């Protein structure tokens, strides 16, 4: 038996564009994911978020599932252009109505909201002005955040500025695989810097508006391991951790500068007086959210850009081909404590995609996903025994949904969605997790 601390928060997580559909309903402005997915060639099968899980219309049923499962917290994101269709200026009341009904319903049913302010659906209007590449986005973002804090901060007390700024910057602006689909290393690093500035400015506004609330920020992370004991493989791991994991953002927030290895590598691409902003970037945060999915074997590689390559291992993998390495969640939790000692930590995403089949019984027998979640939850419990201030754990995701450039082909839910009928089918992992929450841990 592995029992969690009293008061531990068990949650599930979604994002607005991945589940809502109706992107243009009720006066919403377009997002960069609406325009990106409507561009041929960017998303598998030509999938878009036009309908998704139709959560825009089915939100009450989906909250009733969270309730039936006994899940205690729901991490969801708000669509910036539903709220401010032009990015700044005029507030769309019907956008506020939509999330208000959600928030009120969650509270009525005793489910704690965790609101992600930005989960990648930038208003298109702002992308016309440069989006994350433009310094002024710190103002735009602070303004938008103010509107949310004023309208929802009476009821919502747990907030996240940004989901995975590394991904927004690097995948969206260097690899070009996500919206807005750019491949320019100088833009990518200006995005990294502006995300940090926007985040800190939103926290500053949060201190003025929501006095009894907590605010944090969420990072993607992988568990990097060296391919050999050669010094250059060991340095490669250190590089990959500093660049791809929390230190890229937490070294600024807690220590006032980018990690040594990141400066070494990327000083050319950062704005020349970037350090002038570090004072403000260090605005105090209440918690760190860590997302974690996979582990990678790394080697120094002279032919690779960045000089690092991944080495495939004989390990179990998900349907994404991502190696399943549960002790990675223990390592990332121990390490964030050793390096930055944040006051509270949450696992804000953990989950897996598997080739789910609805059987003749009308059920989804996803033992593979249970085994995945079980192993990671056990490792998180171990981190807690060793003194990591892990306050909650959120499964990605409540629902199968639009998996970005993968479209609907990759299913992460603990609830299956038949897109033809929009029927929800709770998966065996869904029932299993319900029991984890009831037991407050593993039996």
Ligand X SMILES: CCCCCCCC/N=C1\SC[C@@H]2[C@@H](O)[C@H](O)[C@@H](O)[C@H](O)N12
Residues within the interface to ligand X (CB under 6 A)? 15, 18, 163-164, 167, 220, 291, 293-294, 322, 349, 396, 403, 412
Q: Is the peptide bond between 180 and the residue preceding it cis, with omega within 30 degrees of 0?
A: yes
Catalytic: 403?
no
* Residues near 83 by beta carbon (within 8 Å), at least 6 away in sequence: 91, 92, 95, 96, 144, 147, 148
**Selected catalytic residue, list 20, 225, 323, 349:** 349
Catalytic residue among 164, 225, 323, 403: 164
Nearer to ligand X, 239 or 396 (CB): 396
Residue 389 CB, nearest approach to ligand X (Å): 22
- Closest alpha carbon to 407 in 26, 49, 106: 49
Q: Which C-beta is closer to ligand X: that of 278 or that of 395?
A: 395
Nearer to ligand X, 151 or 291 (CB): 291
Min separation Cβ 229 and ligand X, Å: 23
Instruction: Look up residue 65 and give its two tokens.
Output: 């599932």
The distance of closest approach from Cβ of residue 360 to ligand X in the complex, given in angstroms and rounded to an integer, is 29
In the complex, residue closest to ligand X by CB:
293
Q: Which is nearer to ligand X, 34 or 153 (CB)?
A: 34
Q: Which is nearer to ligand X, 111 or 405 (CB)?
A: 405
What are the residues whose beta carbons fall under 8 Å from the beta carbon of 31, sequence distance 6 or more?
A: 17, 23, 79, 80, 81, 121, 122, 123, 124, 179
Taking the C-alpha atoms of residue 42 and residue 20, their distance in angstroms, rounded to an integer, is: 20
What does the radius of gyration of the chain's CA atoms come to, in whole angstroms?
A: 21
Nearest to 256 by CA among 238, 272, 280: 280
Phi/psi for 209 (5° steps) reads -110, -40
The Cα-based distances of 423 to 6, 16, 357, 375, 416 in angstroms read 35, 19, 14, 29, 8
**What is the four-CA torsion angle of 44, 49, 53, 57, rounded to 10 degrees?**
-170
Q: Closest separation between CB of residue 394 and ligand X, Å?
A: 11
Active-site residue 349, yes or no?
yes
Token output for 161: 């500025």
Least CB distance to ligand X at residue 166 (A): 9
Ranges of H-type helices in 20-54: 32-37
Nearer to ligand X by C-beta: 62 or 349? 349
Contact present, 210 and 159 (Cβ < 8 Å) = yes
Least distance CB 341 / ligand X (angstroms):
25
Q: List the end-to-end C-alpha distance of the chain, in Å, as a whole number.
A: 5
Q: How far is the CB of 91 from ligand X (least distance, A)?
A: 26
Nearer to ligand X, 322 or 340 (CB): 322
- Give the active site residues: 164, 349
């Amino acid at each position: 038996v592995k029992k969690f601390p009293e008061g531990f928060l068990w949650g599930v997580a979604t994002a607005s564009y991945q589940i809502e559909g109706s992107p243009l309903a009720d006066g919403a402005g377009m997002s960069i994911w609406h325009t990106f997915s409507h561009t041929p060639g960017n998303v598998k099968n030509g999938d878009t978020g036009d309908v998704a899980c139709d959560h825009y219309n089915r939100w009450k049923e989906d909250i009733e599932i969270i309730e039936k499962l006994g899940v205690k917290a729901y991490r969801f994101s708000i669509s910036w252009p539903r709220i401010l269709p032009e990015g700044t200026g005029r507030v769309n009341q019907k956008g506020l109505d939509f999330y208000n009904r959600i928030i009120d319903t969650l509270l009525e049913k005793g489910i704690t909201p965790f609101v992600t302010i930005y989960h990648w659906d930038l208003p298109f209007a702002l992308q016309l002005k440069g989006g994350w590449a433009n310094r002024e986005i710190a103002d735009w973002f602070a303004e938008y955040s103010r509107v949310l804090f004023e309208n929802f901060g009476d009821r919502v007390k747990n907030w996240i500025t940004l989901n995975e700024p590394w991904v927004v910057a690097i995948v969206g602006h260097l690899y070009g695989v996500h919206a807005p689909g750019m491949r320019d290393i100088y833009v990518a690093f200006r995005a990294v810097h502006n995300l940090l500035r926007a985040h800190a400015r939103a926290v500053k506004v949060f201190r003025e508006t929501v006095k009894d609330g907590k605010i944090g920020i969420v990072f993607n992370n992988g568990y990097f391991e060296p391919a050999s004991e050669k010094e250059e493989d060991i340095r490669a791991v250190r590089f990959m951790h500093q660049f791809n994991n929390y230190p890229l953002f937490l070294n600024p927030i807690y220590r006032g500068d980018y990690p040594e290895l990141v400066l070494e590598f990327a000083r050319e691409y950062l704005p020349e007086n970037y350090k002038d902003d570090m004072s403000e970037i260090q605005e105090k945060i209440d918690f760190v959210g860590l997302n974690y999915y996979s582990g990678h074997l790394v080697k120094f590689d002279p032919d690779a850009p960045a000089k690092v390559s991944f080495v495939e291992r004989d390990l179990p993998k998900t349907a994404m081909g991502w190696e399943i390495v549960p002790e990675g969640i223990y390592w990332i939790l121990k390490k964030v404590k050793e390096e930055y000692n944040p006051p509270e930590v949450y696992i804000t995403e953990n989950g897996a995609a598997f080739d789910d089949v609805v059987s003749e019984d009308g059920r989804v027998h996803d033992q593979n996903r249970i085994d995945y979640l079980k192993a990671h939850i056990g490792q998180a419990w171990k981190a807690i025994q060793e003194g990591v201030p892990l306050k909650g754990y959120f499964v990605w995701s409540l629902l199968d949904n639009f998996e970005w450039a993968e479209g609907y082909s990759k299913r992460f839910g603990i609830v299956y969605v038949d897109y033809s009928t929009q029927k929800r089918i709770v998966k065996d992992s869904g029932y299993w997790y319900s029991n984890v929450v009831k037991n407050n841990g593993l039996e």
